[PDB]
Amino acid sequence: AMDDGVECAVCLAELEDGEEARFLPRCGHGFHAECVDMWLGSHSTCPLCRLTVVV
C-alpha cells in the first residue's frame, strides 16, 4: 500500500476514517486524538517534531 502519508508516531496506525486525529498548527503532523492524548501525559506538544500547539 502507499506507506507515505501521515503515520502516527505513537500507535503507527494508518489514520483511517472513524477516528479523531488531531493535527497541529506549527507543523500539521496529524496524530490520533487517543494516541496524541496518551502521548501528552506531560509533553503538551507535537509527538513527532515537538512543536507546541499553544502560543
Q: CB-wise, 27 or 40, nearer to Zn ion? A: 27
Q: What share of the chain is helix, strand, coil (3-state, %, to 5)?
A: 5, 10, 80
Q: How far is the CB of 46 from Zn ion (least distance, A)?
A: 3
Query: Considering the complex, what minimum distance in angstroms separates the CB of residue 36 from Zn ion?
Result: 8
Residue in this structure with the C-alpha cell 501521515, named with its chain if needed: 6
Binding site for Zn ion (CB under 5 A): 8, 10-11, 13, 27, 29, 32, 35, 46, 49, 51
Closer residue to Zn ion (CB): 2 or 15: 15
- Helices in 1-55 by DSSP H: which ranges? 35-38
> What single-letter DSSP state applies at residue 32?
-
